[PDB]
C-alpha cells in the first residue's frame, strides 16, 4: 500500500474491530502518541494500553475529514466517533501525524486532541 | 502561489509580527476556529480576536515540522512558540488544518490542542 492507503486502511480496521490487521500495519518500534499523555513505545506496550483505552468501548467509528502526505508522513483530520459499552455515543475532534518506514510500516502516531473534550466523554 | 506557499507565507508573517500581510491572505469570511473555544467569523472578528489574544504576547515563534497538501486542504504539524511582555516563553503543541478556495484565499483555519496546554501557558 501507498502512506495515504496505509492509513486509511489502518482507520478501517479501527472501524471494523480487526485490531490483529491494524497491529500488522504497525513496526514492533511503534510510538503511539496521544499527545496530551505519555507515549506509549513499542507493540507490546500499545497491546497493552488499547486494550485498556477499549475496556468500556465496544465500537470505534473514526471519521476521516481530510488527510494528505509528504512522503512518508501522512496527516489527518478525523472526527473519533466511539460507542461504549451502554451503547452510548460520543465523538471527540481529532487531527492526527502519521510517519511511516520505507516498507511502509507506521513507526509514529501522534493525535492532537482537547483533553477537556476526551475526559468528558471517557470519565466513568 | 501554491496553497502550500500560502500556508508558509501565512505562517512566516505570524512570526515577522505582519499582522495586515497574514489578514491579507485571508477570504473576507474566513473562520478561524481554534477547536476547544468558539470559532471566529469574518476577517473583523479575526482583526479583534488577534489583537486580544496577542495583548500580553510580544513575539510568536511558530516552527512547522510537518506540512502537507491535498488540493485547496493543507495541514500542519507545529509548536507555536510565543514570548510573553515580561520575556518568559511558552510553546504550544498544535496541528492545523487549512482550507483554500481556488485562487488560493484562506477560508478557514482550524487548530487542534489540548486546551489545559493552553491554559497553563496563556493563565495570568
Known amino acids: ?8 486502511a489502518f482507520i478501517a480496521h479501527w472501524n471494523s474491530g480487526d ?7 504497525c513496526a514492533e ?5 496521544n499527545i496530551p499523555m505519555e507515549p506509549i513505545a513499542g507493540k507490546p506496550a500499545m497491546r497493552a494500553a ?4 477499549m475496556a468500556n468501548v465496544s465500537q470505534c467509528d473514526w471519521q476521516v475529514h ?3 502526505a509528504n512522503g512518508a508522513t501522512v496527516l489527518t483530520e478525523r472526527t473519533d466517533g466511539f460507542t461504549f ?3 452510548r455515543r460520543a465523538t471527540i475532534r481529532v487531527m492526527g501525524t502519521f510517519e511511516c518506514d520505507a516498507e511502509r510500516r507506521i513507526i509514529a502516531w ?3 486532541f482537547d483533553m477537556l473534550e476526551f475526559q468528558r466523554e471517557f470519565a466513568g
Not at 488499547?50 to 483505552?53: A, C, D, I, K, T
Open 29 to 33: 518500534d511503534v510510538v503511539w502518541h
Open 19 to 25: 485490531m490483529e490487521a491494524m497491529y500488522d500495519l
Open 85 to 87: 459499552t451502554n451503547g
Open 66 to 68: 481530510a488527510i494528505a
Open 1 to 8: 500500500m501507498t502512506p495515504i492507503e496505509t492509513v486509511t
Open 110 to 112: 501522534r493525535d492532537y
Open 50 to 53: 488499547v486494550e485498556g483505552f
